[PDB]
Design a protein around this nucleic acid. Structure first.
Ligand SMILES: [Mg+2]
Ligand SMILES: [Mg+2]
Ligand SMILES: [Mg+2]
Ligand SMILES: [Mg+2]
Ligand SMILES: [Mg+2]
Ligand SMILES: [Mg+2]
Ligand SMILES: [Mg+2]
Ligand SMILES: [Mg+2]
Ligand SMILES: [Mg+2]
Ligand SMILES: [Mg+2]
Ligand SMILES: [Mg+2]
Ligand SMILES: [Mg+2]
Ligand SMILES: [Mg+2]
Ligand SMILES: [Mg+2]
Lengths: 305, 132, 201, 23, 76
RNA sequence: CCAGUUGACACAAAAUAGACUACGAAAGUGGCUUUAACAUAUCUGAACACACAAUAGCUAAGACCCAAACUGGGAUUAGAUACCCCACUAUGCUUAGCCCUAAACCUCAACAGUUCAACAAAACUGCUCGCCAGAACACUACGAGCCACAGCUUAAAACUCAAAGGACCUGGCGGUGCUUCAUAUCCCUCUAGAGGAGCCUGUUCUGUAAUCGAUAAACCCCGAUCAACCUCACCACCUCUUGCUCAGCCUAUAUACCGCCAUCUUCAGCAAACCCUGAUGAAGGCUACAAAGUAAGCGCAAGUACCCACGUAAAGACGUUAGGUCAAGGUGUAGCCCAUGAGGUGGCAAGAAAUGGGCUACAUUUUCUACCCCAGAAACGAUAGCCCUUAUGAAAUAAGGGUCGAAGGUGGAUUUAGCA
């Protein structure tokens, strides 16, 4: 235990010297100085994130353990000292006493989290018994003080994934309600300019979509979003496609058009499109060619057989 | 398995250093680079001669001190500066230390046409990684 | 597999996408979506069964050429059917179909098998035991039969689109090799029937 | 224990019976 | 006597550390190494209530007399 | 005479009650009527005698549809007096001439009583006879008794040795019944290269002045990101014990190493230091209405970076094949010290025979062409090798121009990765 204090004092002297280095007047600096140091005079470069130079006051990094467990002629800090982990059992006894008191009157954390909170290494069945006792307490006459005391060991709900980042209609640049977007499909990117009016054709890369992709699958993919939203003809575009080749560019244009549509579309249809699958990028992307194999995942023939 | 530079568990209080305990797939992850020389660079060329010179200097410096170099050096080429960071151990007296250091410095400076200088590793604790 | 467990598989059609409602909306919102491929489209006209057929017909691992050839053959068959129908009577739209989707549906109905012979074993000897199969499995088997029949690798004369169109016209009304193979399989299954008493599941 | 000490006894008895039946 | 058909194992641990133990033994117990076996009922509630009340009173009076007499003696 | 309602011929066999308790020294028994049925109640006292037969068997035979020893004909059959299907001969029910041996075990003798070497049919003493204190030879030769003439009661002596026998400890094993179960890993299902074949390519090994590395498990487009004198590290002629080495060895001991790494792993844990469970022995430390784990140290977990966090390069613990290597390179020890090193000079490239790892075709897919998809030949694949050569050299390897322009019509139960 003395080594902990020795290292703490050594690092305190080191931090004093570090503060004395700078000739400025702010002694209670924040993480800015540590960041500047790691950027200038401590660039390790190790890929890992633990062995990197993260020098910090060990007053909070060095963990703590049970201090003294006895005083004048033994005398621990509780009557459940010989039971191992006296704190947990004392808390359980207090919970049982509160249970009996309430009876007379009338999300959860993980094991590691409870261990870090306390100073005991509890198992799983003891945690289950503690949860059972807490549930019995919450059920025994629903109040307020006890409910808050029990929730202290719990967290809020914090619901996510609900609304969609509605993009503005964008009326600047020109006198047309256009909207930027993008699309990805096996390493590819684009930037479309889907207007709001213009019930006619579409200019794909400055040229009509007749001499660009005579295949019907390309036109079907291009219609995918407009057909899903039912706003077919009433749309003009002057996108600039790049990267990919055929199906990649088709999917990129499809995603760009879907995003441009969702930009200025009712929340209902926006959510329907987002849930149908035509906004994000599927995981089907140019993977890493396996060096220990002939092709992609195709391993050698008589490997295990 | 792979024992490129690691040592599996055995006892508890055995001798072992940082370089004497690492895996091949952790050359740049949990382990650093003991030679930040101007050789294996890109798109810059010139690597064979640089590596040869680095190996020669490392072997010469290891042969200098008798029984005091556990790990290799960490050469540094700041243009025309050859900085050595040897893991030297307190051998005997400081007179011999200074004499040998000055002799080697002058010899290397007059031979390689570049200033050379080293510094001992006066630390009462090695860079032990795994307790083993 | 790269399909991470955090993502999910959405739909493709927009049949229901024309608007318990709040619960379903929240459930769909609590999902990480991917992206539809090039073949699968939301066009209500483009029936997904033809999409699955083209997917199964992926020759050389290329869906573009397979889809193009399938669409060309479907267009040719539709042209022939409408020439046999339009250039004949007035408006007899009940005796002959009206789209290639219906043609493919009829072909599947006429080729979709119903019994699946299986060599079930009980220790070290197989046993003829007809094993049931759902609609998806029967459709896949019919598609594989059609594929291996169209590309039997033994014609050595006719062309791919012409062969496909001829075989489709045959399977239309009780003709072609697919229905013959189905009948042969049914006969082989009905030959030895008193043997399904050795199934472990 | 098990029936193990009688195996050699039976072997000897069978050898004797075979020798008798032979000649 | 715990919930399982078996006495408490702490008796052996105490015998393995030279500790004079007291025990409210009964018919299902095994007063083999207990230095002060206390036969009595263990099913009735009033019995255990009286046991615990007597223990509390006795130890409290013992501690009080300890404090008083030890102070009076050290004052010498 | 197969299925029988109106019935039929055995010395058979005890459907539930048999879940019942008995005697007999012990065999021994269960659906029924009758003759006769349980000795001494102090114990023991012949393995030199009176008698039983456990089941079976020789002799004289009676004798039950019902069984087999002798059985024929046939799954499987590589080799089956058994196994899978029919019944039958000594014998099962009966009277006599007979060995009475067994697992006649309840391996634990009858009475008087009293309160753990291990497996356990709990412990402690008297009474009576029997038993042995080297096994295999030795349920046997020989001797004594029996009407057995294959046997029974006893049944020994030689060469070999450290014996020999029983129990105990957690494991590998479960074609052990079962529990969690295997997600492309496994059968039911398939997507598809390769199996019959053209080209690059070597494997068991051939050859001289042209070694090759376990050249199975982890080699056969592995080291070779490749074999004209270099690369081939392998040998001879001009000369040596200064051989360019104040000599080295690419020479060898895988039963001695450093060195890199798959494998089981697509698991799940190993243990220092402590404290316990066996009358403390080989061992173990075992489950929350809690029955002994804290567990130095090595771990999945935390991913180490990215296409985020699944998925990729690589594991993922103590370890798994005296694992591959004395020669990818160096090395204890031995040998060369008229070399197996070599200073300078000369030497291969082909598959006798089979095969597989990659690019390719059997079909309009071999040619994609001005258009990557709005227009189509030979009706086949329309090779290699060879010549002109991009490069050079004392012997061609990736391929451009000419010639040949083939090999066989997915060809063997199929093979391997794949849940995008
Ligand atoms: Mg007697
Ligand atoms: Mg007598
Ligand atoms: Mg008898
Ligand atoms: Mg018979
Ligand atoms: Mg008979
Ligand atoms: Mg009878
Ligand atoms: Mg006897
Ligand atoms: Mg017996
Ligand atoms: Mg080897
Ligand atoms: Mg490995
Ligand atoms: Mg990990
Ligand atoms: Mg990997
Ligand atoms: Mg080895
Ligand atoms: Mg020589």
């Amino acid at each position: 235990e003395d080594f902990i204090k020795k290292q703490i004092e050594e690092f305190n002297i080191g931090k004093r010297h570090l503060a004395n280095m700078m000739g400025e007047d702010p002694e209670t600096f924040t993480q800015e100085d540590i960041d500047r140091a790691i950027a200038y005079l401590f660039p390790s470069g190790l890929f890992e994130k633990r062995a990197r130079p993260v020098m910090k006051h060990p007053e909070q990094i060095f963990p703590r353990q049970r201090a003294i467990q006895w005083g004048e002629d033994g005398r621990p800090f509780h009557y459940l000292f010989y039971t191992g982990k006296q704190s947990y059992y004392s808390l359980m006894h207090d919970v049982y006493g509160m249970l009996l008191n309430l009876e007379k009157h009338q999300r959860w954390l993980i094991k590691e989290e409870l261990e870090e909170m306390l100073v005991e290494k509890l198992s799983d069945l003891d945690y289950m018994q503690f949860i059972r006792l807490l549930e019995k307490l919450l059920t025994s006459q629903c109040g307020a003080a006890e409910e808050e005391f029990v929730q202290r060991f719990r967290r809020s709900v914090t619901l996510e994934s609900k609304k969609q980042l509605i993009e503005p209609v964008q009326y600047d640049e020109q006198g047309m309600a256009f909207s930027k977007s993008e699309g990805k499909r096996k390493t590819a990117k684009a930037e479309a300019i889907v207007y709001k009016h213009g019930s006619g054709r579409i200019k794909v890369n400055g040229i009509d979509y007749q001499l660009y992709f005579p295949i019907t699958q390309d036109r079907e993919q291009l219609m995918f979003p407009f057909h899903f939203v039912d706003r077919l003809g009433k749309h003009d575009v002057t996108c600039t496609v790049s990267g990919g080749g055929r199906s990649a560019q088709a999917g990129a244009i499809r995603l760009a058009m879907a995003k441009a549509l969702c930009s200025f579309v009712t929340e209902d249809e926006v959510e329907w499109m987002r849930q149908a699958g035509l906004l994000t990028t599927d995981p089907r992307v140019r993977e890493r060619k396996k060096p220990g194999q002939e092709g992609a995942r195709r391993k050698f023939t008589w490997k295990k057989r | 398995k792979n024992r490129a530079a690691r040592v599996r568990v055995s006892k508890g209080d055995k001798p072992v250093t940082y370089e004497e305990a690492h895996a091949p797939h952790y050359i740049a992850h949990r382990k650093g680079w003991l030679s930040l020389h101007t050789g294996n660079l890109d798109g810059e060329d010139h690597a064979a001669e640089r590596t040869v010179e680095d190996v020669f200097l490392r072997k010469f410096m290891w042969g200098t001190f008798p029984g005091c170099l556990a790990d290799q050096l960490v050469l540094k080429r700041r243009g025309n500066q050859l900085e050595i960071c040897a893991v030297v151990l307190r051998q005997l007296s400081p007179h011999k230390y200074y004499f040998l250091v000055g002799y080697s410095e002058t010899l290397l400076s007059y031979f390689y046409k570049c200033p050379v200088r080293l510094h001992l590793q006066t630390v009462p604790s090695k860079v032990v990684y795994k307790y083993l | 597999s790269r399909y991470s467990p955090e993502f999910k598989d959405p739909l493709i059609d927009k049949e229901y996408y024309r608007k318990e409602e709040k619960y379903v909306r929240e459930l769909k919102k609590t999902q990480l979506i991917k992206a539809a491929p090039a073949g699968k489209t939301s066009s209500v006209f483009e029936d997904p069964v033809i999409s699955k057929f083209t997917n199964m017909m992926m020759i050389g691992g290329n869906k573009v050429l397979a889809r193009s050839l399938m669409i060309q053959t479907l267009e040719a068959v539709k042209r022939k059917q409408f020439e046999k129908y339009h250039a004949a009577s007035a408006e007899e739209q009940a005796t002959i179909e009206r789209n290639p989707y219906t043609i493919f549906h009829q072909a599947l109905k006429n080729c979709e098998p119903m019994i699946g012979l299986v060599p079930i074993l009980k220790g070290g000897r197989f046993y003829q035991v007809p094993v049931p199969l759902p609609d998806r499995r029967r459709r896949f088997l019919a598609m594989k039969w059609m594929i291996t029949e169209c590309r039997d690798k033994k014609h050595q004369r006719t062309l791919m689109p012409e062969k496909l169109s001829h075989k489709l016209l045959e399977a239309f009304h009780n003709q072609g090799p697919v229905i013959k193979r189905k009948h042969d399989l049914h006969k082989m299954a009905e030959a030895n029937r008193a043997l399904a008493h050795y199934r472990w599941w | 224990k098990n029936v193990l000490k009688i195996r050699r006894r039976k072997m000897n008895h069978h050898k004797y019976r075979k020798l008798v039946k032979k000649t | 006597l715990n919930n399982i058909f078996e006495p408490h194992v702490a008796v052996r641990d105490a015998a393995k550390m030279n500790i004079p133990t007291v025990g409210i033994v009964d018919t299902n117990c095994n007063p083999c190494l207990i230095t002060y076996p206390v036969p009595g009922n263990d099913d009735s509630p009033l019995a255990v209530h009286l046991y615990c009340r007597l223990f509390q009173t006795a130890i409290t009076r013992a501690k009080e007399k300890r404090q008083q007499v030890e102070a009076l003696y050290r004052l010498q």
